[PDB]
Amino acid sequence: XXXXXXXXXXXXXXXXXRXXXXXXXXXXXXXX
Amino acid sequence: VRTKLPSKRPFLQTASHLAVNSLVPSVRTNRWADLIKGPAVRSCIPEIPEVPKPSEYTTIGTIEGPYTLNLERVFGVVELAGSQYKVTPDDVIFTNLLHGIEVNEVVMLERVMLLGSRSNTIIGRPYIPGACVLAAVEEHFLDGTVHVFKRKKRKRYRRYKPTRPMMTTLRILKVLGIDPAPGDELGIPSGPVIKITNTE
Amino acid sequence: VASYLARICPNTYVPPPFVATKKGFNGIGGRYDPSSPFPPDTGSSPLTLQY
Amino acid sequence: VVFKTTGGKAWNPPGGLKPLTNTQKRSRKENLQILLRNLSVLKLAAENQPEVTVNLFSPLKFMH
Amino acid sequence: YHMLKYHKLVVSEPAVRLIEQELTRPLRNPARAAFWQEREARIGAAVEDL
Amino acid sequence: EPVRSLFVTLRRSYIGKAWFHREILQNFRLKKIRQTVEVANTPSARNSLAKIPHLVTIETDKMYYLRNMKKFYEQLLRPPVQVSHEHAALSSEIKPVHNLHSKHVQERLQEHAYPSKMEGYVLHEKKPVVPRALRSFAFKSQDEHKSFVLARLGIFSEEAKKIHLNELRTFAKRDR
Amino acid sequence: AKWQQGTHKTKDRSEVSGGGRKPRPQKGSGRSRQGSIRSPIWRGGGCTFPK
Amino acid sequence: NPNYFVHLGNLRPNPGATQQRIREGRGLSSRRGVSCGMGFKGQKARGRSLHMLYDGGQLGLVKFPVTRQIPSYEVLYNQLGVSKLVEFIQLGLLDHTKTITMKELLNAGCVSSLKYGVLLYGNVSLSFPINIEVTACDDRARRSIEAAGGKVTRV
Amino acid sequence: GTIFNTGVPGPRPEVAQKLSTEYQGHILRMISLAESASELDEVLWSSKKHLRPVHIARSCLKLEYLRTKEKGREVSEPIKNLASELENYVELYSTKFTIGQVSQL
Amino acid sequence: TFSREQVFTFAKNFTGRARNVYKVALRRVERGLQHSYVGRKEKKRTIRSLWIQRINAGCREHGFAYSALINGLNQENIQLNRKVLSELAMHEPDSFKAVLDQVRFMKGQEIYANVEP
Amino acid sequence: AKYGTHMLESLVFKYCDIGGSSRGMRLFLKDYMDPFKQTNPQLRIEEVQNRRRHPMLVALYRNGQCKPVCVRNLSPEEIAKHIFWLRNSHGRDDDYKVPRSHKVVRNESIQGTWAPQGPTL
Amino acid sequence: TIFNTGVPGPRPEVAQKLSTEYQGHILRMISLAESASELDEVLWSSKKHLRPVHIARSCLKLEYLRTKEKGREVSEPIKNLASELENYVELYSTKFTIGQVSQLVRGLSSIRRNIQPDLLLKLAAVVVADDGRQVQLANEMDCRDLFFGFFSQGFDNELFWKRLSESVLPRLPYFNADVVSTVLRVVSGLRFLHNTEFAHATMTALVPKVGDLSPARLADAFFSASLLDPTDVSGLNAKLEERFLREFTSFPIKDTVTMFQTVTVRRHSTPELAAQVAPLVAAQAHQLPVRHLRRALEGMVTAGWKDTAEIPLYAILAKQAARLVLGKQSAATSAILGKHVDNQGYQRTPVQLLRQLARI
RNA sequence: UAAGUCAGACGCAAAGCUACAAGGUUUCGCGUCAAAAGGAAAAAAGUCCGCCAGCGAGGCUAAGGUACAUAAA
RNA sequence: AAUAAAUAAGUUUAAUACCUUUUGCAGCAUGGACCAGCGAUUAAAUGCCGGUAAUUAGCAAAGUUAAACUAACGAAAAAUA
Ligand SMILES: [K+]
Ligand SMILES: [K+]
Ligand SMILES: [K+]
Ligand SMILES: [Mg+2]
Ligand SMILES: [Mg+2]
Ligand SMILES: [Mg+2]
Ligand SMILES: [Mg+2]
Ligand SMILES: [Mg+2]
Ligand SMILES: [Mg+2]
Ligand SMILES: [Mg+2]
Ligand SMILES: [Mg+2]
Ligand SMILES: [Mg+2]
Ligand SMILES: [Mg+2]
Ligand SMILES: [Mg+2]
Ligand SMILES: [Mg+2]
Ligand SMILES: [Mg+2]
């Protein structure tokens, strides 16, 4: 479960929320 | 045991075991716990990722000469040097010492938490992307002396240690991110002439 | 502030600072500190003059 | 705690040690729940121990 | 003390010879000093041969 | 799921605890409140932790990870929102601060917020007034010099005459 | 050090003139107790550690 | 003057060769500030009163017996080892082709200062004869010299 | 025992009769009776101001005897370090040794 | 021990013999400097108390409570501190109310970088 | 600087030519005096040679402040530290402390100060 | 008096990070690391106290670790550790010194890792900034690593090499022979420096002192000199040939093979030289990699040596080449050990080398 | 350190002496004071929480609190 | 204990001198009315233990004083001849 939870968080670019190409899909962080 | 002299029993026992080991070899030659001991690891759990934050302050240019400022009808909240400030153009704030900037330079502040006007308000959770505040560096100064004194009555104890804190002064120039309410637009030139010296 | 000379003279070359020691030699590393009030030494004890 | 009611030193107000308030009772209940919870966790660890112990890195052990 | 006090030092030829003679004179037992010098010379000669 | 390590956090201080319990905390290398360490799940470690269940909080590797990941997701940035409040009738006048009449508010503005006192050193230069108790220290050198001159050179001297001329100027300025 | 002459001297309480008698009674007067007028504490007294 | 000139105004001692004296009774923050490091009361803190060897009255050191044996007068002799005598001969400071007397030993430097005599002692393996005259000798030295063919005479 | 404090081995009569004597040579006996490399190093360190070529020759010869005791293994670290320090004294006294002393060295 | 110059500089505003008499002024100077160390520590406690009072007064004018607001902010991930919130209630009533409405009712319109994705 | 105008008006260097206490000042002048002048065209820099006991720095500001500083037995790096704080400050007195709110504003309220909701008297 | 009964048990095992008190031990710990995994743990524990000096030294350590694994592909842990050190270099890109940059490039070049083109430009700027003021402070070892390190990375910036050459030109006469040899290697490898004044200066500086050249450096110098200066304008090639003749027997097998091929290219080979080479090459044919075997075959064939019954060198070389291609040495050792399941790493030769050997 | 100290006090928990008294006295286990500022109980040496290198109008908590005095339902 | 930290200048909050002596002192325990000047581990010889150097020391001037050193078990065999 630790391996299956680290991957999901790793597949998230939080630094891309302050790049002006963003929409309401770059903040849908939790449930893809 | 009544005596307070430290006991030498551990020394006497060690000398006996050392003598036996030196002369009499052991029968076993392996230990399973040592044989299967694995490589050293940093931890047994995945590391916790960090939360990104906007840049604190960055230089964008310099000021050429004397200028003037007028009052506007917008305000904002910015986080800087460990504390928050409510700022509007032509305000003066005092902060801790900021490294890497010089007097008569223009800096850009991006950690904006709140923007407001007379007709609308924008709330960041916790920061507003695409907003910034401009300010001019005016001073790097030593503040007034603070006298630190300690004493303990009847104990012959006394200490004196004066000190001078280091601080920085800024003047707010412009707030970007929210439009003024209708009829509140400043329709004349307001700020200085800035020589841009930061291209990325 | 690592160096105040580099702050008041933004466009000049500032040589490396001299190594400060408890004993107080002026000739450490083959360099002489011009501000010292004593003749140059070899950076060790006993004190010997370095020309 | 102090239970003594005699002497000139006034450790307690006249009448001796005062009874606990409702907040104090709630405070002592929570301190015991934490202690009981810790013992429950150690029971889980003992029932789920692996065969081989994990080796953790330490800079000071590495140097020596 | 006098040498450090004054900036310049001027000496005569006979003075130079006398100064060097006194600064090299054996402190003790002139005879013993010569013996050790001779032995070192012989060792130095043997080293050259080898 | 095997439990491979334990996380131990300190809750209580060293003050007021028996010396045979402080040794256990030192073996785990806990020194500050809220400090955490990670240890291997072994029977010897569990026995020691059973002697001080009132000084620490204990959790397994899985519990520690889940708790910290829940906090991480809560602190992630979320979209900003805006709230509008319409005021149809607005005035164009800029009202002053309610304490503008105060001399202490004005002093702060004069010192830091206004383009004041930029006309030059000569215009704004002023001489400070020495406190009465500090005057024997401010003029010590001048008094010594006058004694030095009169003792060595005498009163029929050029230096003595200069001092007297300066004293005449000071006395004349007393009449105001 | 060799050239220093060292011809210097002072007087202690046993070398200053007078001072034999006890100047005040031990008790009763309300003053401090004293044993001699040439004590180091007194003006004109001897030196505690003479040269 | 250049920087490397030496005059009376730029001399200092070697670091570590000197240390400042402690002057006590000169302030709260000074070393040995008020009471000068002597404590508060008692006999030790009131000047020269107590000898450092007094033990309080038990007097434990004088509870032991006394011995009166007289040591031998030969402890007043200068001791010379046979191994040291050979080393001088090998280096060439002594002439082994003629009789060796105490005068030769004194001049060679084997013996420093003689008031009574010289005592010869020790064991050594010799390959050449030696004839030496001393004031005293043991048996180990006599056997060593005579084994090579020498002669030891007590004068 | 009775003579020394707890844990201190009692005297050996053979060693005691060697050290208790009317004749000089105390330092030579101390280095000759050393039983380990560390012990010999301490003797030389505490007697530095009185060492002579005869003392250096014996010290280097003792390295042969200590090595023999520690057989079944190569030269240990303490022996190597002790040998290095002795070499500095050999250089210092290189011009004062006799033929016999050089042979032992 | 302070010198005469230091003592009289500190005591220039003292009353009576405390101004120019060394023995009297010295003890008054040291006691005052002790007050200052305590004074700086207490200042940080008092100012935070004043902020909370002003925030609570503003909250209750609308029918809310201070403790409810602090909890509500943490659920929305809003990290404004008490110094800023105190100033908003006094000088920016409209913005302060907007924060309360978002926390209580959550009826704010979200803003995205791309208005039309 | 205030509104883009520098506040330091002049800087005077006083030193002796043979005194040992001025050794550090002489080194600074030899090596860094010229680069310092070029960086600060708006500053009037004056050097005074005299027979005084110790070197000194004197700073004069457009607001009438005078700040003499002693640089006795200091090295060029130590001298530069004093210059940095003198040039970049407004020259306020050593006993002055800035407002405790860390902000001075002329326009404190945009929307208006809070007022009671009712007929005042 | 007694509050616990029994013998004290084992101490608990606690995961710890490096403390600020031991920040001065980081360089020592890097040296004491004996594997990539250990070095990875050392850096991780000291993450909060890493400085540019530590990042540069770690990359240099990769060369030392990889040396123990010669004859095999670079291990995965080394590659993964390198991928992380590169990110640290990017953060500290502008805070390195000239001496530290040289260490970084050599370490990554030895591992055969290509640095990003943008990073090379930033690293190059550090070296040549301020009119090469810091180049006068780089020592001989730093200069050697800078020339070979950047050359091995495929750096092809004309401006960088122009400025770097100008600063080093006045220092060539005082450099050691081994350093000068490396400079010639770079000059010959860079086409635009073929006929510059710097190239001529390097040759003139090497001629006066050739007795100090090591075997490996001597072979490279002869190769580079022949290519750059076919006609002996400077007395370098003639002097190099004389040294080869005098000490032919003392040089190692690899250098003798390389130097012999150069002579044949120079057209100074003789039957006597070919006869003398054969007995030495035949005895030590097993000490030549595939690259040196190809050189030996071409040199002997050009010289005209013919197979002899006593010393059939061609037959021996063919067998040796087959062993290297097949990698039978690992299998042969496992046969004696008795465990044939032993893992066998290998470095497959390129098809181009196979064709060249087949034609020869 | 060939230094200082050899006048100790109280809280909880035991025993002897006293009267299963004393802020009594004699031993013993732990803690605090002595040599310890800060917070809670009214003032508060020894009880509860907790150990002060310095500055700041940032944040989270312990013991204890959450209609007024007096911060928070 | 006559001040401190702040302030919209109206005021609000914090806050029982110092020394000496004590288990413990705001102490109803001791000393000082205030200012200037004076006022207390110093010198010699000897011994012990660290630090820094000289590389024996002093006289005399090819010869003398002072100190220091001076036998413990002659134990290694590393030859791909
Ligand atoms: K506690
Ligand atoms: K003492
Ligand atoms: K008075
Ligand atoms: Mg009472
Ligand atoms: Mg609680
Ligand atoms: Mg007199
Ligand atoms: Mg007493
Ligand atoms: Mg005492
Ligand atoms: Mg007693
Ligand atoms: Mg007693
Ligand atoms: Mg009692
Ligand atoms: Mg006491
Ligand atoms: Mg809270
Ligand atoms: Mg309230
Ligand atoms: Mg009493
Ligand atoms: Mg009185």
**DSSP per-residue string spanning L198-253:** HHHHHHHHHTT--TT--HHHHHHHHHHHHHH-SS-SSTTHHHHHHHHHHTTTTS-H
Q: How was this structure determined?
A: cryo-EM
Task: Tell me which chain B residues have a C-beta less than 8 angstroms from the C-beta of H33.
Answer: 156
Interatomic CA distance for residues L43 and L53, integer angstroms: 13
- Both tokens of H131, joined, read 């004839």
Closest ligand to C-alpha of residue J67 is 13
Q: Taking phi first (over 0 means left), then psi (-120 to 50 degrees means alpha), and beta for anything else, what does residue G18 get? A: left
Cross-chain residue pair F77–B121, CB shorter than 8 Å: no
- Both tokens of H69, joined, read 């044996």
Distance from CA of D58 to the nearest CA of L (A): 5
Interatomic CA distance for residues F101 and F65, integer angstroms: 59
Please count the CA atoms within 13 angstroms of the CA of F70 that sit on its side-chain side. 6
Rounded to 5°, the CA angle I67-I68-I69 comes to 90
**How far does the CA of I75 sit from the C1' of N5, in Å?**
74
Interatomic CA distance for residues C22 and C45, integer angstroms: 13
Q: What is the largest CA-CA distance in chain D?
A: 64
Nearest alpha carbon to residue J110 among A32, F74, B123, B76: B123
**How far does the CA of H58 sit from the C1' of M24, in Å?**
36
User: Do J110 and F81 meet the contact criterion of CB atoms below 8 Å apart?
Assistant: yes
- Both tokens of K60, joined, read 């004069």
Q: Taking phi first (over 0 means left), then psi (-120 to 50 degrees means alpha), and beta for anything else, what does residue B26 get? A: beta
Interatomic CA distance for residues L88 and L65, integer angstroms: 20
Are there at least 3 beta-carbon pairs closer than 8 Å between A and J? yes
* Secondary structure letter of residue K5 according to DSSP: B
Distance J50 CA to ligand 14 centre (A): 11
Interatomic CA distance for residues F113 and F108, integer angstroms: 8
Rounded to whole angstroms, what are the CA distances from J56 to C17, J70, L339? 57, 11, 81
Rounded to 5°, the CA angle D48-D54-D56 comes to 135
Q: Which residue is nearest to nucleotide N67 (CA to C1')?
A: H112
User: Is the minimum CB–CB distance between F71 and chain A shorter than 8 Å?
Assistant: no
β partners of residue B83: B80
User: Do B58 and B107 meet the contact criterion of CB atoms below 8 Å apart?
Assistant: yes
Distance G25 CA to ligand 6 centre (A): 25
Are there at least 3 beta-carbon pairs closer than 8 Å between B and L? yes
Name the residue facing F4 among D31, D39, D54 (closest C-beta): D54
Distance H51 CA to ligand 9 centre (A): 19
Query: Positive or negative CA dihedral for L40, L45, L47, L53?
Result: negative
- Both tokens of H149, joined, read 């063919």
Element (DSSP H or E) covering residue F9? strand F5-10
In chain K the first and final C-alpha atoms are separated, in Å, by 48
Element (DSSP H or E) covering residue D39? helix D22-47
* Secondary structure letter of residue H133 according to DSSP: E
Rounded to whole angstroms, what are the CA distances from L127 to J22, L102, L158? 66, 9, 14
In chain F the first and final C-alpha atoms are separated, in Å, by 98
Please state whether strand M lies within 7 Å of residue B146 at its CB atom: yes
Residue of B nearest to K90 (CA): B139
- Both tokens of H46, joined, read 């009131």
- Both tokens of L268, joined, read 């100074």
Task: Tell me which chain A residues have a C-beta less than 8 angstroms from the C-beta of B41.
Answer: none
* Secondary structure letter of residue J106 according to DSSP: -
* Secondary structure letter of residue C30 according to DSSP: G
DSSP, collapsed to helix, strand or coil, labels residue F77 as coil
Distance from CA of F67 to the nearest CA of B (A): 11
Measured in whole angstroms, the distance separating CA J13 from the mean position of its chain's CA atoms is 29
User: Is residue H132 exposed (0-12), middle (13-18) or buried (19+ Cβ within 10 Å)?
Assistant: buried
Interatomic CA distance for residues L297 and L358, integer angstroms: 11
User: Do B137 and B59 meet the contact criterion of CB atoms below 8 Å apart?
Assistant: no
- Both tokens of H83, joined, read 């191994």
Interatomic CA distance for residues G8 and L241, integer angstroms: 89
- Both tokens of B100, joined, read 């890497």
Ion ligand 8: residue ranges with CB closer than 5 A = H 39, 42
Q: Strands K8-15, J109-110: parallel, antiparallel or unpaired by DSSP?
A: unpaired
Q: Which residue is nearest to nucleotide M58 (CA to C1')?
A: B83
Distance H41 CA to ligand 7 centre (A): 6
L219 residue type, one letter: A
Tell me the H-state helices in chain C: 5-8
Interatomic CA distance for residues J15 and F132, integer angstroms: 14
CB atoms within 10 A of CB J41: 9
- Both tokens of L84, joined, read 């992380």
Phi, psi of G49 (to 5 degrees): -130, 85
Rounded to 5°, the CA angle F123-F128-F131 comes to 170
Distance from CA of H46 to the nearest CA of B (A): 21
Measured in whole angstroms, the distance separating CA L235 from the mean position of its chain's CA atoms is 28
Interatomic CA distance for residues L253 and L260, integer angstroms: 11
β partners of residue B109: B57, B133
Cross-chain residue pair D59–L13, CB shorter than 8 Å: no
| Stated resolution in angstroms | 3.1
C-beta contacts of K101-105 below 8 A and 24+ residues apart: K102/B83, K102/B85, K102/B93, K102/B94, K102/B95, K103/B85, K103/B86, K103/B87, K103/B91, K103/B92, K103/B93, K103/B94, K104/B91, K104/B92, K104/F108, K104/F109, K104/F111, K104/F112, K104/F113, K105/B88, K105/B90, K105/B91, K105/B92, K105/F113
Give the contacts of E5 (CB within 8 A, at least 6 positions apart): H8
Q: Smallest CA–C1' separation from J65: which nucleotide?
A: M73
User: Do L66 and L109 meet the contact criterion of CB atoms below 8 Å apart?
Assistant: no
Distance from CA of I74 to the nearest CA of B (A): 17
Q: Dihedral through CA F169, CA F170, CA F172, CA F174, nearest 10? A: 160
Please state whether strand N lies within 7 Å of residue G48 at its CB atom: yes
Interatomic CA distance for residues L355 and L358, integer angstroms: 5
Task: Tell me which chain F residues have a C-beta less than 8 angstroms from the C-beta of J4.
Answer: 137
Interatomic CA distance for residues A5 and I97, integer angstroms: 79
Cross-chain residue pair C39–H14, CB shorter than 8 Å: no
Q: What is the 3-state secondary structure (H, E, C) of chain B?
A: CCCCCCCCHHHHHHHHHHHHHHHCCCCCCCCHHHHCCCCCECCCCCCCCCCCCCCCEEEEEEECCCCCCCCCCCEEEEEECCEEEEECCCCEEEEECCCCCCCCEEEEECCEEEEECCCEEEEEECCCCCCEEEEEEEEEEECCCECCEEEECCCCEEEECCECCEEEEEEEEEEECCCCCCCCCCCCCCCCCEEECCCC
Query: Positive or negative CA dihedral for J54, J57, J63, J64?
Result: positive
Interatomic CA distance for residues L219 and L213, integer angstroms: 9
- Entry field: residues in chain L: 360
Interatomic CA distance for residues L123 and L105, integer angstroms: 9
Chain M: nucleotides under 7 Å from a protein CB? 3-6, 10-13, 21-23, 29-32, 35-36, 41-44, 46-51, 53-60, 63-66, 71-73
Cross-chain residue pair D48–F54, CB shorter than 8 Å: no
Interatomic CA distance for residues L43 and L85, integer angstroms: 10
Element (DSSP H or E) covering residue E47? helix E30-49
Phi, psi of J34 (to 5 degrees): -65, -40
Burial F57-67 (b: 16+ CB within 10 A, else e): bbbbbbebbee
Burial L143-173 (b: 16+ CB within 10 A, else e): bbbbbbbbbbbebeeeebbebbbebbeeebe
Distance H41 CA to ligand 11 centre (A): 26
Please state whether strand N lies within 7 Å of residue H87 at its CB atom: no
DSSP-assigned states of every residue in L79-103: HHHHHHHHHHHHHTTTS--HHHHHH
Interatomic CA distance for residues E15 and E17, integer angstroms: 5
CB atoms within 10 A of CB H136: 17
User: Do A30 and F73 meet the contact criterion of CB atoms below 8 Å apart?
Assistant: yes
CB atoms within 10 A of CB H86: 22
Please state whether strand M lies within 7 Å of residue D9 at its CB atom: yes
Task: Identify the residue whose tokens are 């006691």.
Answer: J31
Sheet of strand F56-60, all strands in order from the earlier edge strand to the far edge: F36-40, F5-10, F56-60
Cross-chain residue pair B129–A6, CB shorter than 8 Å: no
- Both tokens of C17, joined, read 């600072």
CB atoms within 10 A of CB J104: 14
